[PDB]
């Protein structure tokens, strides 16, 4: 189909981004690397949102793929389960990482990305990643409702990233140690009031079951 | 007739507004307010260390300032007073008039929007941005379509958030630069 063919040519194209941006100059280069005409990249706007949005789509499935890898290792019981905060560090560095190769040219692709009219795929693509973390997380110790963990987990990713595009320090550790300060921001938002009074209530019905067996003797 | 602890708190925090220019989006001038109206050092201990509360303050006390902005505009229309805009003409007016409200306290407000990005804030300020965006699609009266609730939100809530971005670093006359900007975005959208 169609559609086929202009995966084939953004996905060669991204081998040129470093050199030319998100741009039809590396569209045009994708498409004669596949010996196709530099007028092939006529499929596509000037944008280089195609080829951006391309590149975000195939970030998050690689994402998933390693995301699954890590925890049938732990059904293995060759890894221990991660606590959430470790592993929500780890699930965006490993994501984040995957921008390296094209960081020279990642603060224009953000501002494309924010165009209006490619919001809502953007948005999309964003939630659908940060749900897709959520769930390998487990979590299933904090309490935050879904909308708590969409925002958080997207902020901490979100600052991160814009971080991480004025980031000269060695493999960017600058951007990781942020990074494990807003998780850490975060984590410590699941200590609501309401939670001190579900704790506080649990250790009063604690305290009257040692009563009764004190009572009982 | 007595106040309660949540009014004294909103007293303070308006008071704190003085004091932005000089000590920033702060503790420091939260305390500042505070004794400005005679409260002891004590009285910042009620306020976290971030000065989010003053920032959330301020965002929420624009929003209201806004709504109310639209009200009248809108009551003109219900009169006969002054005909319908366009939503296209109509969203840049709004955002126009909403982010005018930061000029005088623009020399710290980069600080306050990345305060405002921080995890323990994000449902705060998420939320009170959806609800002015929400405010502001509301009296668009803008009825279909071509976006649904949830482009019409999100697109929006980018042009705000983005166009802020920009007025940020905008030293042209009378932030012509952003204005320009805010008139792109809307054009892109509603194409
Ligand atoms: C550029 C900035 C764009 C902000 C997008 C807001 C769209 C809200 C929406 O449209 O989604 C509303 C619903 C809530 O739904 P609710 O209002 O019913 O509660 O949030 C969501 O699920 C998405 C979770 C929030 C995503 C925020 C990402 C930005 C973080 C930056 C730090």
Redesign the interface.
């Known amino acids: 189909s169609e559609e086929q063919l202009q995966h084939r040519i953004l996905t060669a194209a991204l081998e040129f981004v470093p050199a030319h941006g998100w741009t039809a100059e590396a569209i045009a280069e994708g498409a004669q690397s596949l010996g196709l005409s530099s007028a092939a990249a006529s499929m596509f706007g000037k944008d280089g949102s195609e080829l951006i949005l391309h590149f975000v789509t195939q970030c998050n499935t690689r994402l998933t793929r390693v995301l699954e890898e890590e925890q049938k290792l732990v059904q293995l019981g060759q890894a221990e389960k991660r606590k959430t905060d470790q592993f929500l560090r780890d699930a965006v560095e490993t994501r984040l990482r995957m921008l390296i190769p094209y960081i020279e040219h990642w603060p224009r692709a953000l501002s494309i990305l ?4 490619n ?2 795929s953007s ?1 999309s693509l964003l939630t659908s990643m940060v749900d897709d973390m959520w769930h390998y997380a487990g979590d299933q110790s904090t309490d935050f409702n879904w ?2 963990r969409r ?2 987990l ?3 990713y ?2 991160t990233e814009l971080v991480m595009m004025q980031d000269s320090s060695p493999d960017f550790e600058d951007t990781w140690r942020f990074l494990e300060n ?2 850490n ?2 984590m ?2 699941g200590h609501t009031a309401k939670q001190v009074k579900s704790t506080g209530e649990a250790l009063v019905q604690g305290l009257m079951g040692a009563a009764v067996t004190l009572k009982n003797l």
Do not use: E
């Open positions: 924010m165009l209006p009219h919001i809502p948005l909308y708590t925002a958080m997207a902020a901490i979100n600052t807003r998780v921001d975060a410590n938002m």
